[PDB]
Amino acid sequence: SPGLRWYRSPIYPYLYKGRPVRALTVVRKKHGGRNNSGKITVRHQGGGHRNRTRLIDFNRWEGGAQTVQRIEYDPGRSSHIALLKHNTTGELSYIIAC
Amino acid sequence: ARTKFTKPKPKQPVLPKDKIRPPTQLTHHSNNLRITEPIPPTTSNLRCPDDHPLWQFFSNKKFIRSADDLPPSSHIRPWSIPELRHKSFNDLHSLWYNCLREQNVLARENHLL
């Protein structure tokens, strides 16, 4: 197809090919770029694919050693995310992948 | 599509005589069966009782009270409030239910009319 001719995407085979942990995901509510008025404030935003926002830990408070179990695709950000598992505690969390 | 070039399909694969199971049912309906005329249900089998409580909605078992069967306006009066005032509770209750019954009888008739 002529639409395929210029379709490039980087291949990451180590990347996870499963669903994210469901407890760490919230629904990504769409807006269409409309503010509380209901009027288009930000132009050019609309009906994409359905998504879930992932609750990724930016603060990084708890401390202690945590093993990265897997690295995932995240639809709401250009970076990959890494599912950490706390070695002592056993608590599960997402983190921006290095 | 069907065409000049379309060769006919093969016949379906029949199961051999020995391998086929005998059917569970062997003996079917009688061939002698005949369409007889219908038999319409009759009142003769009923024994409708003479004191069926639904007769209480009628008056002397009449489909409709004629002018003569009705109580005339001059002969009849409604109750006076003072008259009612010296009647017992149970009596009043009974009177009320009699009134209601009478209304039902009339209501049936009135509707029909």
Partner: protein, 156 residues
């Protein structure tokens, strides 16, 4: 021990045996009910063991059964409910349209049969004689809807 429907059936049988209510009596005691019911003629679809009533629009199926038991002494075993539609009617096209009343009609099944008394002849009963009112109606139709030279046209 036993299923629910079976228990209900047993209860009903017990109540019948007693000559008490064949059903659980409620607690909301209405001493002076104002509700009337219109016993209707039977349709072709019903049996001699059925009877149908026009009842109040706010009348319950259970309520009806209770009414039949206590007021009249009749025990309705099964009851159905048929709330009718209210078709639009108007006196004339100059007037506002409105619906005729939604009317509730409840069929009952009963353990003894019943057939209505036969409707009277035209000569016998004064009221049950549709010739006169129909004739009057026809005459009214003729006279109001008579326009020009149909005034001379002889009456039907």
């Amino acid at each position: 021990d036993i299923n629910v429907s079976e228990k209900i059936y047993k209860w009903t049988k017990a109540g019948i045996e007693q000559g008490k209510e064949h059903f659980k009596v409620g607690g909301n005691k209405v001493y002076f009910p104002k509700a009337r019911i219109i016993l209707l003629r039977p349709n072709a679809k019903h049996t001699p063991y059925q009877a149908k009533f026009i009842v109040p629009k706010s009348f319950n199926k259970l309520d009806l059964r209770d009414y039949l038991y206590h007021i009249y002494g009749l025990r309705a075993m099964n009851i159905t409910t048929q709330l009718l539609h209210g078709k639009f009617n108007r006196m004339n096209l100059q007037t506002t349209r409105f619906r005729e009343p939604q009317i509730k009609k409840m069929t009952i099944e009963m353990e003894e049969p019943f057939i209505w008394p036969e409707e009277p002849r035209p000569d016998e009963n004064s009221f049950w004689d549709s010739t006169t009112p129909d004739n009057m109606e026809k005459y009214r139709e003729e006279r109001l809807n008579c326009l020009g030279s149909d005034a001379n046209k002889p009456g039907t």
